[PDB]
Design a protein around this nucleic acid. Structure first.
Lengths: 621, 237, 647
RNA sequence: GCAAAAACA
């Protein structure tokens, strides 16, 4: 409660923190008793001196660092859990103020310090009389009396006696009103004591069946999925340019290019070619950022939301209903196999230029040899060049959208072959991109050099005819939006190399373990199910196709892809179990293929993986 | 003394400008030690490219040893903010320190380099070998120190005056004198938090889950990332 | 998919790490969470009876049901009380050392827990500013509110904080206090009950997005107490998924003719079929057989009873479309598929006694599952982490194994766990399985990461970024997720990204400045050749360069000088370890920063241990400053002059 | 247009 009358303020706010009174059984009474002890300590010291310095040091409720300093002087040392309350310079001894019930049953607590005892009605132990002065004893009398009157008046005699006898006891209390609030939404008390005999009932269950044959995934029906990635992929080409800087290459392209529309798409109108030509002209002049032209409204969707809202408001009819969304079901397109076969085609250069790490030990040499050989086998491939293009384009787009501009930024996609020549894959144009959150979409107008045009594969792309010098090239424009998170993720697209490298390294190290000798020239034969038959292919091209699949999965990642993979892990495990002549058993209502089929809706590579699974044997002997 | 006067003036400033904060319990320091208004960034690596390329990326304490403009390049904003090339300038035209300070700062890190280069490597053996992970002491220490006594050992080295008898008692003696001798040039008001960090790592016996083909000594545990794997084992003499 | 399934020299288990989307972007949860939250809330009310009856399940307080009510052909919400009692008793009897450690933690370590550890928690909804706030700010405002309403100072221990919460819950009126925020017992109760929901971001492997709930700061102390006790138990039981355990079971050779099987599966709707009262009963049984006092029981039972009264926020509203228009409307305004729950709407929150939410009691749910495991028929090795489990059966007969698996399913159903039939697969000969992203094949357990290492600098500063990148790659190597070639390739990719992020590649302003001023590149972040090899991932950059002669003593003294204007992460301090970069909160933050700055200078020991030292900051600083002046071996006159100015 | 059970423009 509040401060007792006899205890003065200073001791009260000194004792407020010394101990956790609220968690003690009699914390208020315990605090009052400790305040009594501190007041007795202060009365014993008072205004007394020995050799010009105070005779007593009141260690109780004093800073521990100060106590240790004072003990460093005088050459004493006291543990913190048995620290005496007082130290007397006259006798060079330390005292502890103690309260007891009777003075007859008193013994020295310990040899470190002497005991000052009081029985709570004023009188003291004979040792206290032999030590303390008459005035000090009278003051202790006059405090313990008129503290006892407060004890009796509030009827705390038993609580005080309990506090004196034992030490502090921990507790935690919940009162009536909080208890009633707690009991509102349950059928039991605060401590649940249901009146039921413990028992485990016998419940009839269903029967466990066997998955004799592997599940057959569902192939969806509908229009084939168009290409819906940020960039072109396997159909990506570059224009060889004379050696120089990016500005020189862009000027060379812009000065000797004629552009005519071949195929026009309603999604990307042919009028947005003006934006790309203006960006090329500005970049050739040294300005990667240009002002806004009229076609930039359509190209980057400026003020599109505030027009669609008015269109919807004008076209308002009927009553409100819960918005049921739907995802169009699409079938496996023919272009996925073409993309896979084209991504593995060989290239002249290496396209993977990573600085080598240091080499100090033989383990480092082995690791760097493995990495070098993996780069050799997956470098001179089209998929590596496409990964490089994706990396450069995403990095340059990401690095230019933090500014929050109102103008159009141009980010050319240019590589260098090991001869100095500039390779122009295309350019990405960034709109105003007033981006608030990391998931916000930045408007883009991507131009890429196209190997071949397919309206079925690219319905939303506008394909233009591009002629430089005497060569013919195809240029594709697509209006697109793409978030900060996804652009940052694809700027680190080189991490797709890890998993094929993991597989290659595991195969090589397995061979090394078998023969107890590292050989980086191993190109073993890997048996696989191909066109529904068991033939084999070499390690190198198998790793190439794995890298192609991983790149396609990475650029086509979405909730369907991740759900499909997470639910095909179980079926892949089951298939591997059935290869080892193991039996697979399922609970009641177990349809593992349903978890996968829920995820096959319109993803081209999910469908490609599903068809690859379906062409495999479903029963093993 | 200047140090005492500086401490007093800052203390009076805290009492005046932040009275309510000074009226809090001293144990509350464990709470407002990390009292930050800024929300946690789930993707801090995603801002590095922009942050490095901003004008004046680096925040610096005001000083005169760095020119405002160095060969047509403005180094500081004239707290004050520094150009990204300021650490590059300091690596060539900066103020030097004593060799003893360098040795103490590189201590517990120079030791790891010496241990790597003072050991000889056997031939790599490739085979079907199963790395099973157990918790072992990751890094060798100057003295073997029981955990939960590491903080008490640190108190004796750094602030032996601000400690109790029991904390003094439950402290590894022998490791205090080694730590005191090697940390002496950097046990000052500045780099006190750094010197504690090197002091911890010198006697920290934390256990980590590491691949094992044979039982790792503390020497081989810090190198378990290349000593063993699923397909190879390296013998250390 | 056939390309991912080899038939020679390598098995599909190793290549099953290819069925991942490491490089692709993680899915983003857009827009309202109201539909997902309402679905999560309504699932327990549809699974309480075999034939769905939401209206009859909405007036159930304690999710207790008869054994005949349990649905074996579908999901079942609720628990059987006698089953819970017997299972908890069996769990207590078998794992006796774990409960002895629980008793020691309760008696010794529980009273010493400090409520400042609540500041280390994640984001918390503030009942004063009515907004989401960082954990330190919420803790500070809650403690100040408690002190204002209780006329006393809250002790540093967690028990003192919980006692303060219990005491303030008993006041008719509470205030905050210049704006005066006025509460009531019912309003403060509602804030205590309320769960703040949000999308679970950056989650992989799911077609549908999930939501998670956060407790109020008024209940997080009790939640931390119960979760710490649950962790103390789970760290000492062999059926918990915490150490290893999967590898131990994989390497355990059973017999030569025994019928040994391996069951791998997930739990369907794990948090949507759990009732807090079952955990209350389990905890009460544990404490009662431990001999704990009644106040321990009350302390452990408060959290789950508050959860039984939860007021989970139902997002921003349900999406409605007239034509092409889109509107966001609360539940109950117009008909929807959640019209049964309209009667439970309290403001923008909805009350729901049954079911739980993900991210609230992860360890107590695991404990409930593990006590469900404890039977006489289930003589098999079980390991489980929340909703993911693996079970090993060592039987002598296939029918015996099948009966044990069915008994496992039913005994999980007794408390409402309901493993997913389509996600649980049992292999008749043991030796192939999966559990918690570890893939087991014969005498090999392969840890496959759910997320590939970022291979990008963390964004603090070049030395720390290099240190943590190398440490992440080294940890990936240690877990087995990476090997020699993979580790070195990751190092090279990280090195390229690290150099690019710090203007060390091509021609930039930094490289131009270094070239014009003849500043040779001596560090990796400066464009120098990388000094780290695969075997030297654990070595610092400043070292290993002095040793190899790439850094001379002059530049070492120049960059390691502590007086530089710019200044586990085992990176030595250097000039390259720099730093790049709510009305009444910023000023309070800067005042607290100044108060922190005066400490760590007068108190060297707070850098080693906690603050302790009972008392307030003012007089503690006062007396420490007095002591340091008095023990400064200076003249008496100077000491007196200095102390005369200390006020 | 990007996206996928609803946001960005």
């Amino acid at each position: 409660t509040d401060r007792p009358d006899h205890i003065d303020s200073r001791v009260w706010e000194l004792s407020e923190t010394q101990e956790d009174w609220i968690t003690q059984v009699h914390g208020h009474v315990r605090r009052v008793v400790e305040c009594w002890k501190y007041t007795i300590c202060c009365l014993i010291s008072n205004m007394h001196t020995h050799r010009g310095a105070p005779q007593y040091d009141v260690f109780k409720w004093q800073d521990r660092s100060t106590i240790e300093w004072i003990c460093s002087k005088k050459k004493v040392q006291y543990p913190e859990r048995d620290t005496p309350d007082l130290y007397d310079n006259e006798r060079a001894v330390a005292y502890k103020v103690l309260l007891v019930s009777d003075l007859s049953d008193h013994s020295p607590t310990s040899g470190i310090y002497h005991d000052l005892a009081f029985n709570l009605e004023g009188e003291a132990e004979e040792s206290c009389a032999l030590v303390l002065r008459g005035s000090q004893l009278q003051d202790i009398k006059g405090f313990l009396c008129r503290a006892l009157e407060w004890v009796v008046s509030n009827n705390l005699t038993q609580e005080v006696v309990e506090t004196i006898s034992g030490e502090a006891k921990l507790q935690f209390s919940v009162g009536t009103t909080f208890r009633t609030l707690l009991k509102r939404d349950t059928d039991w008390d605060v401590i649940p004591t249901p009146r039921v005999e413990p028992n485990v009932p016998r419940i009839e269950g269903r029967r466990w069946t066997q998955m004799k044959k592997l599940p057959l995934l569902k192939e969806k029906e509908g229009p084939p999925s168009p290409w819906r990635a940020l960039l072109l992929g396997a159909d990506s080409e570059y224009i060889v340019c004379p050696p120089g800087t990016d500005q020189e290459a862009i000027s060379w392209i812009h000065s000797q290019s004629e552009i005519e529309c071949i195929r026009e798409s309603k999604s990307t109108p042919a009028s947005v070619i003006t934006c790309l030509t203006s960006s090329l002209q500005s970049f050739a002049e040294g300005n990667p950022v240009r002002s806004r032209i009229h076609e930039d409204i359509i190209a980057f969707g400026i003020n599109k939301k505030q027009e669609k809202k008015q269109s919807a408001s004008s076209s308002a009819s009927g009553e409100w209903k819960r918005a049921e969304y739907q995802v169009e079901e699409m079938s496996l397109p023919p272009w996925v196999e073409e993309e896979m076969v084209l991504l593995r085609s060989d290239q002249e250069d290496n396209w993977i230029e990573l600085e080598k790490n240091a080499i100090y030990t033989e383990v480092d040499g082995v690791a760097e040899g493995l990495v070098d050989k993996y780069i050799e086998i997956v470098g001179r491939t089209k998929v590596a060049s496409v990964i490089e293009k994706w990396q450069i384009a995403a990095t340059r787009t990401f690095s230019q959208l933090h500014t929050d501009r109102s103008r159009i930024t141009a980010c050319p996609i240019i590589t260098r072959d090991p001869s100095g020549n500039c390779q122009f894959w295309g350019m990405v144009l960034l709109g105003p991109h007033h981006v608030k959150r990391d998931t916000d979409n930045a408007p883009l107008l991507i131009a890429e050099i196209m190997g071949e045009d397919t309206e079925e594969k690219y319905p939303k792309h506008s394909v233009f005819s591009l002629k430089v010098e005497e060569k013919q090239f195809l240029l594709s424009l697509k209006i697109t939006s793409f978030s900060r998170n996804k652009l940052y993720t694809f700027s680190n697209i080189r991490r797709v190399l890890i998993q094929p490298a993991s597989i290659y390294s595991q195969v090589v190290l397995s061979r090394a373990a078998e023969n107890n000798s590292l050989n980086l020239e191993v190109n073993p034969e890997i048996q696989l199910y191909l066109e529904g038959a068991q033939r084999g292919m070499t390690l190198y091209q198998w790793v190439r196709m794995i890298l192609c699949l991983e790149f396609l999965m990475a650029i086509y990642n979405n909730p369907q892809m991740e759900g499909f993979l997470a639910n095909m892990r179980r079926l892949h495990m089951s298939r591997h179990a059935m290869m080892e002549r193991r039996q697979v058993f399922l609970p009641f209502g177990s349809r593992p293929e349903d978890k996968v089929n829920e995820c096959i809706i319109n993803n081209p590579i999910v469908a490609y993986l599903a068809k690859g699974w379906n062409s495999m044997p479903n029963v093993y002997y | 003394e200047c140090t005492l006067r500086a401490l007093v003036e800052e203390y009076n400033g805290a009492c005046k400008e932040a009275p309510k904060e000074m009226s809090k319990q001293f144990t509350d320091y464990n709470t407002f030690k990390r009292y930050t208004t800024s929300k946690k960034d789930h993707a801090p690596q995603m801002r590095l490219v922009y942050s490095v390329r901003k004008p004046w990326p680096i925040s610096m304490t005001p000083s005169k040893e760095i020119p405002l403009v160095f060969n047509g390049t403005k180094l500081k904003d004239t707290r004050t903010r520094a150009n990204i090339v300021v650490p590059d300038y300091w690596s060539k035209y900066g103020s030097q320190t004593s060799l003893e300070v360098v040795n103490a700062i590189l201590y517990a890190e120079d030791l790891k380099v010496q241990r790597f280069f003072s050991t000889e490597w056997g031939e790599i053996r490739y085979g079907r070998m199963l790395p099973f992970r157990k918790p072992v002491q990751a890094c060798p220490t100057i003295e073997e120190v029981n955990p939960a006594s590491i903080p008490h050992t640190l108190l004796q080295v750094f602030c032996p005056q601000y400690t109790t008898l029991d904390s003094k008692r439950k402290a590894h003696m022998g490791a205090v004198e080694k730590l005191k001798r090697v940390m002496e040039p950097i046990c000052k008001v500045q780099t006190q938090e750094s010197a504690v960090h090197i002091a911890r790592s010198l006697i920290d016996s934390n256990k980590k889950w590491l691949p094992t083909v044979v039982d790792h000594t503390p020497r081989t545990a810090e190198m378990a990332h290349f000593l063993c794997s699923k397909y190879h084992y390296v013998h250390t003499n | 998919m056939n390309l991912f399934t080899p038939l020679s020299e390598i098995n599909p288990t190793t290549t099953q790490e290819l069925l991942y989307a490491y490089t692709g972007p993680a899915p983003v949860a857009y827009g309202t969470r109201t539909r997902a939250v309402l679905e999560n809330i309504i699932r327990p009310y549809q699974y309480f009876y075999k034939e769905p009856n939401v209206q009859r399940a909405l007036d159930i307080k304690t999710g207790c049901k008869e054994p005949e009510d349990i649905n074996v052909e579908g999901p079942s919400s609720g628990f059987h009380t006698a089953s819970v009692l017997k299972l908890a008793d069996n769990f207590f009897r078998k794992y006796r050392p774990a409960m002895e450690k629980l008793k020691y933690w309760i008696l010794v370590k529980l009273p010493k827990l400090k409520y400042a550890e609540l500041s280390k928690g994640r984001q918390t909804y503030s009942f004063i500013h009515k907004r989401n706030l960082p954990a330190p700010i919420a803790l500070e405002e809650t403690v100040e509110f408690l002190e204002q309403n209780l006329r006393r100072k809250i002790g540093p221990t967690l028990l003192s904080y919980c006692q303060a919460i219990a005491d303030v819950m008993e006041l008719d009126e509470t205030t905050y206090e210049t704006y005066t925020i006025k509460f009531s017992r019912e309003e403060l109760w509602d804030q205590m009950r309320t769960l703040n929901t949000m999308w679970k971001h950056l989650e992989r492997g799911r077609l549908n997005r999930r939501t998670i709930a956060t407790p109020s700061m008024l209940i997080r102390g009790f939640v931390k107490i119960v979760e710490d006790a649950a962790k103390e138990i789970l760290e000492n039981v062999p059926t918990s998924g915490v150490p290893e355990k999967l590898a131990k079971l994989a390497s355990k050779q059973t017999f030569h003719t025994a019928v040994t099987g391996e069951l791998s599966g997930d739990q369907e709707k794990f948090n949507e079929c759990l009732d807090p009262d079952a955990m209350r009963l389990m905890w009460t049984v544990f404490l009662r057989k431990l001999g704990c006092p009644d106040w321990i029981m009350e302390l452990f039972n408060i959290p789950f009873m508050v959860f039984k009264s939860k007021l989970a926020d139902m997002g921003e509203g349900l999406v409605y479309t007239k034509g092409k228009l889109t509107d966001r409307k609360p539940l109950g305004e117009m008909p929807s598929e959640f019209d049964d729950l309209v009667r439970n709407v309290v403001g923008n929150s909805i009350s729901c006694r049954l079911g739980m939410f993900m991210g609230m009691y992860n360890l107590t749910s695991t404990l409930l599952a593990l006590i469900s495991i404890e039977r006489e028929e289930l003589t098999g090795s079980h390991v489980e982490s929340s909703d993911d489990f693996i079970h090993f059966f060592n039987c002598k007969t296939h029918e015996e194994m099948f009966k044990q698996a069915e008994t496992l399913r039913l005994t999980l159903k007794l408390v409402g766990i309901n493993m997913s039939p389509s996600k649980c697969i049992l292999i008749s000969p043991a030796g192939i399985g999966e559990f918690n992203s570890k893939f087991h094949h014969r005498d090999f357990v392969g840890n496959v990461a759910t997320e590939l290492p970022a291979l990008v600098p963390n964004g603090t500063n070049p030395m720390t970024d290099l240190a943590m990148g190398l440490n992440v790659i080294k940890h990936s190597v240690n877990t087995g997720q990476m090997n020699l070639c993979t580790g070195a390739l990751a190092m090279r990719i990280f090195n390229h990204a690290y150099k690019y992020a710090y203007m060390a590649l091509g021609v930039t302003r930094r490289t131009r400045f270094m070239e014009e001023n003849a500043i040779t590149p001596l560090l990796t972040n400066q464009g120098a050749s990388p000094v780290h090899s695969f075997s030297t991932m654990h070595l610092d950059e400043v070292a290993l360069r002095r040793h190899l002669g790439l850094l001379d003593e002059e530049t070492l003294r120049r960059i390691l000088n502590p007086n530089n204007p710019v200044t586990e992460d085992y990176s030595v301090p250097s000039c390259f370890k720099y730093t790049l970069s709510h009305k009444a909160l910023l000023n309070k933050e800067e005042r607290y920063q100044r108060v922190t700055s005066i400490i760590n200078k007068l108190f060297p020991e707070v850098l080693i241990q906690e603050a302790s030292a009972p008392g307030t900051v003012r007089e503690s600083l006062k007396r420490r400053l007095e002591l340091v002046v008095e023990r400064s071996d200076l003249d008496e006159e100077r000491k007196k002059r200095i102390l005369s100015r200390i006020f």
